[PDB]
């Protein structure tokens, strides 16, 4: 679950998933239209009351 | 059929220093700007790599049956494509299956098959006088083939198999391993202009194939090529010459490595852990 | 339908072995022939209905 946005990554032909330092997936390649998308959370962060 | 080769000149085995060579990608995941650590079968840095080469000048034809000690790093320096494949297997004498990888100038072919091999397998490049054209005329690898399980033939292609005089223009690096019945091959194809020994540099190998052969492999051999022409006198056993080409063979070992990925996802540098204390400290920190 | 009854060592994962050389059960090599203390390794299932 998350927000999917367009991005700019030079994926190699044999790769489809990209992982950051935390090892969670961050970059995906759409199977239909061979573009690259970036996944971000949808709780942005600090909300103090 | 196959013909034993006679014109030879033995020399002590050549040795070379393999430094910062034999590093391949560990997986197929896009990691960028991350220093990742891993342990696998790796070629140790600054190892002593065995060296064979074919030069006419002697005639120095060398392609023995080498052990496949749980992985092999094969690196060839060539200018005319004298090295044209590999054989893998245990007995190589039709009692066990064997793997054959061959570039026969039209298709690259991979076969897992109970080959009955010859003592000195090779291929014949020939040169003609009606036109100044080199071509491949002979295929003297195996006498017979049966019970022939795996088989792949690539698309047709045309390649310049001519004899080129001068500096070695192409380095082709290959890592072979046999893990869980899968023959994993990693490749790197880079132009150079050096002639003596391994280039001073660093290149990370990419994953090529992942062949499902399911074969026990302990020994392997290289398939070289012979120029034959009117200049070369004698029968098929002696009427030949070998162009200038070289290859190096280093044995993989289980080691720990540190790898650095740039922003575009490719490897830029690596550290062989447990080489020297400085590298050991880089590895720990 | 045949199964390999004898082998000098266990298979590695996803490894095939279709050799038919005679298995030297005894300590005396029987140089490629059958007989006593060395057996043909492949034995045939008998599947009666
Ligand atoms: C035998 C197995 C074999 C393999 C595994 C192989 C792989 C291979 N060949 C390539 C190109 C190429 N490969 C060759 C020729 C060869 N390349 C070799 O590994 C060998 C041994 C020869 C010839 C004997 C040539 C001529 C090209 C075109 C690029 C160039 O001419 O420099 C490439 C890179 C193409 C690219 O960047 O998209 C690979 C990975 N070719 C083969 O024949
Ligand atoms: C793969 O092939 C090798 C070579 O035949 C096998 O190793 C040999 O096995 C026999 C019988 O156990 C021994 O006598 C030899 O000493 C072994 N030689 C070496 C270099 O190890 C090996 O057993 C085979 N692997 C499998 C899974 O069958
Ligand atoms: C010579 O060739 C024959 C068959 O062609 C082969 O049996 C023999 O092993 C070969 N000997 C050498 C030294 O190559
Ligand atoms: C290979 O290199 C190392 C270090 O240079 C050396 O100790 C070793 O003797 C060399 N191998 C041979 C067979 O001499
Ligand atoms: C060798 O090249 C020829 C000509 O293209 C081709 O027919 C053949 O398939 C190649 N060898 C093998 C074993 O396929
Ligand atoms: C292996 O080859 C021989 C003769 O070609 C044949 O009798 C035998 O059935 C074959 N076995 C397999 C598994 O192909
Ligand atoms: C990464 O790719 C971009 C695409 O042009 C290129 O400009 C840049 O030089 C590359 N970065 C490195 C370190 O090679």
Curated annotation (Swiss-Prot), chain A:
Q: Which domain of life is it from?
A: Viruses
What does the subunit section of this Swiss-Prot or TrEMBL entry state? Binds to host ACE2. RBD also interacts with the N-linked glycan on 'Asn-90' of ACE2. Cleavage of S generates a polybasic C-terminal sequence on S1 that binds to host Neuropilin-1 (NRP1) and Neuropilin-2 (NRP2) receptors. Interacts with host integrin alpha-5/beta-1 (ITGA5:ITGB1) and with ACE2 in complex with integrin alpha-5/beta-1 (ITGA5:ITGB1). May interact via cytoplasmic c-terminus with M protein. May interact (via N-terminus) with host bilirubin and biliverdin, thereby preventing antibody binding to the SARS-CoV-2 spike NTD via an allosteric mechanism.
The free-text function statement in the UniProt record for this protein reads: Attaches the virion to the cell membrane by interacting with host receptor, initiating the infection. The major receptor is host ACE2. When S2/S2' has been cleaved, binding to the receptor triggers direct fusion at the cell membrane. When S2/S2' has not been cleaved, binding to the receptor results in internalization of the virus by endocytosis using host TFRC and GRM2 and leading to fusion of the virion membrane with the host endosomal membrane. Alternatively, may use NRP1/NRP2 and integrin as entry receptors.
This chain belongs to the protein called: Spike protein S1
Range within the parent protein: 549 to 597 of 1273
Q: Record the organism.
A: Severe acute respiratory syndrome coronavirus 2 (2019-nCoV)
From Swiss-Prot, chain B:
Please report any disulfide bonds recorded for this protein chain, giving both cysteine positions: 2-118, 113-148, 273-283
Per UniProt, what does mutating residue 134 to R do? In strain: Omicron/BA.2.75
- Attached carbohydrates are found at 4, 48, 104, 131, 147, 216, 264
Q: Where is this region: Putative superantigen?
A: 262-283
Q: What is the effect of changing residue 235 to N?
A: In strain: Lambda/C.37
Effect on the protein upon substituting residue 6 to R: In strain: Delta/B.1.617.2, Omicron/BA.2, Omicron/BA.2.12.1, Omicron/BA.2.75, Omicron/BA.4, Omicron/BA.5
Q: Which residues form the BetaCoV S1-NTD domain?
A: 1-285
Consequence the record notes for mutating residue 5 to F: In strain: Beta/B.1.351, Gamma/P.1, 19B/501Y
The impact of changing residue 139 to L is: In strain: A23.1, Omicron/BA.2.75
Q: What does altering residue 192 to V do?
A: In strain: Omicron/BA.2.75
Q: What is the effect of changing residue 204 to V?
A: In strain: 20A.EU1
Please describe, based on the UniProt annotation, the reported consequence of changing residue 54 to V.
In strain: Eta/B.1.525, Omicron/BA.1
**Annotated phenotype, changing residue 6 to I:** In strain: Omicron/BQ.1.1, Omicron/XBB.1.5, Omicron/EG.5.1
> Per UniProt, what does mutating residue 234 to V do?
In strain: Omicron/XBB.1.5, Omicron/EG.5.1
Q: What is the effect of changing residue 39 to H?
A: In strain: Omicron/EG.5.1
Q: Spell out the residue ranges making up region: Disordered.
A: 54-62, 124-146, 155-167, 228-244
Subunit composition? Binds to host ACE2. RBD also interacts with the N-linked glycan on 'Asn-90' of ACE2. Cleavage of S generates a polybasic C-terminal sequence on S1 that binds to host Neuropilin-1 (NRP1) and Neuropilin-2 (NRP2) receptors. Interacts with host integrin alpha-5/beta-1 (ITGA5:ITGB1) and with ACE2 in complex with integrin alpha-5/beta-1 (ITGA5:ITGB1). May interact via cytoplasmic c-terminus with M protein. May interact (via N-terminus) with host bilirubin and biliverdin, thereby preventing antibody binding to the SARS-CoV-2 spike NTD via an allosteric mechanism.
Q: What does this protein do?
A: Attaches the virion to the cell membrane by interacting with host receptor, initiating the infection. The major receptor is host ACE2. When S2/S2' has been cleaved, binding to the receptor triggers direct fusion at the cell membrane. When S2/S2' has not been cleaved, binding to the receptor results in internalization of the virus by endocytosis using host TFRC and GRM2 and leading to fusion of the virion membrane with the host endosomal membrane. Alternatively, may use NRP1/NRP2 and integrin as entry receptors.
Provide the protein name.
Spike protein S1
Name the gene: S
What fragment of the whole protein does this chain represent? 14 to 303 of 1273
Curated annotation (Swiss-Prot), chain C:
* Consequence recorded when altering residue 6 to L: In strain: Omicron/EG.5.1
Identify the stretch(es) annotated as Disordered.
5-40
The reported result of mutating residue 40 to L is: Increased resistance to neutralizing antibodies and human covalescent sera neutralization
What happens upon changing residue 10 to K? In strain: Omicron/BA.2.75, Omicron/BQ.1.1, Omicron/XBB.1.5, Omicron/EG.5.1
* Chain segments carrying region Receptor-binding motif: 1-49
Q: What is the effect of changing residue 34 to Q?
A: In strain: Kappa/B.1.617.1
Q: What is the effect of changing residue 43 to R?
A: In strain: Omicron/BA.1, Omicron/BA.2, Omicron/BA.2.12.1
What result follows from mutating residue 46 to S?
In strain: Omicron/BA.1
What results from changing residue 28 to K? In strain: Delta/B.1.617.2, Omicron/BA.1, Omicron/BA.2, Omicron/BA.2.12.1, Omicron/BA.2.75, Omicron/BA.4, Omicron/BA.5, Omicron/BQ.1.1, Omicron/XBB.1.5, Omicron/EG.5.1
| Phenotype upon changing residue 33 to A | Increased resistance to neutralizing antibodies
**Region of interest (Immunodominant HLA epitope recognized by the CD8+), residue spans:** 1-6
Which Cys pairs are S-S linked?
30-38
**Function text:** Attaches the virion to the cell membrane by interacting with host receptor, initiating the infection. The major receptor is host ACE2. When S2/S2' has been cleaved, binding to the receptor triggers direct fusion at the cell membrane. When S2/S2' has not been cleaved, binding to the receptor results in internalization of the virus by endocytosis using host TFRC and GRM2 and leading to fusion of the virion membrane with the host endosomal membrane. Alternatively, may use NRP1/NRP2 and integrin as entry receptors.
Subunit note: Binds to host ACE2. RBD also interacts with the N-linked glycan on 'Asn-90' of ACE2. Cleavage of S generates a polybasic C-terminal sequence on S1 that binds to host Neuropilin-1 (NRP1) and Neuropilin-2 (NRP2) receptors. Interacts with host integrin alpha-5/beta-1 (ITGA5:ITGB1) and with ACE2 in complex with integrin alpha-5/beta-1 (ITGA5:ITGB1). May interact via cytoplasmic c-terminus with M protein. May interact (via N-terminus) with host bilirubin and biliverdin, thereby preventing antibody binding to the SARS-CoV-2 spike NTD via an allosteric mechanism.
Descriptive protein name: Spike protein S1
**Gene designation per UniProt:** S
């Amino acid at each position: 679950t998350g927000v999917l946005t367009e991005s700019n990554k030079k994926f190699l032909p044999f790769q489809q998933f990209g992982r950051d330092i935390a090892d969670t997936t961050d970059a995906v390649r759409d199977p239909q239209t061979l573009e690259i998308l970036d996944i971000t959370p949808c709780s942005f962060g600090g909300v103090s009351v | 059929q196959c013909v034993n080769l006679t014109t030879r000149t033995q020399l002590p085995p050549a040795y070379t220093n393999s430094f910062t060579r034999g590093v391949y990608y560990p997986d197929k995941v896009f990691r960028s700007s991350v220093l990742h650590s891993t342990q696998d079968l790796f070629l140790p840095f600054f190892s002593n790599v065995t060296w064979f080469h074919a030069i006419h000048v002697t005639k120095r034809f060398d392609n023995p049956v080498l052990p496949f000690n749980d992985g092999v790093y094969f690196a060839s320096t060539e200018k005319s494509n004298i090295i044209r494949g590999w054989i893998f297997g245990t007995t190589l004498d039709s009692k066990t299956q064997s793997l054959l990888i061959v570039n026969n100038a039209t298709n690259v072919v991979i076969k897992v098959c109970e080959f009955q091999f010859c003592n000195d397998p090779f291929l014949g490049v020939y040169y003609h006088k009606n036109n100044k054209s080199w071509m491949e005329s002979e295929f003297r690898v195996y006498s017979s083939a049966n019970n022939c399980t795996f088989e792949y033939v690539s698309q047709p292609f045309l390649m310049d198999l001519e004899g080129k005089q001068g500096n070695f223009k192409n380095l082709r690096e290959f890592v072979f391993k046999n893990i869980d019945g899968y023959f994993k091959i990693y490749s790197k194809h880079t132009p150079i202009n050096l002639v003596r020994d391994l280039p001073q540099g660093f290149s990370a190998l990419e994953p090529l194939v992942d062949l499902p052969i399911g074969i026990n492999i302990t020994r392997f051999q290289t398939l070289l090529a012979l120029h034959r022409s009117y200049l070369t006198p004698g029968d098929s056993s002696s009427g030949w010459t070998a162009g200038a080409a070289a290859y190096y063979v280093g044995y993989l070992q289980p080691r720990t490595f540190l790898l650095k990925y740039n922003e575009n996802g490719t490897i830029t540098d690596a550290v062989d852990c447990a080489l020297d204390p400085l590298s050991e400290t880089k590895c720990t920190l | 339908y045949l199964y390999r009854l004898f082998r000098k060592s266990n298979l590695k994962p996803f490894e095939r072995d279709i050799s038919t050389e005679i298995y030297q059960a005894g300590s005396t090599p029987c140089n490629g022939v059958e007989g006593f203390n060395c057996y043909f390794p492949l034995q045939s299932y008998g599947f009666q209905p």
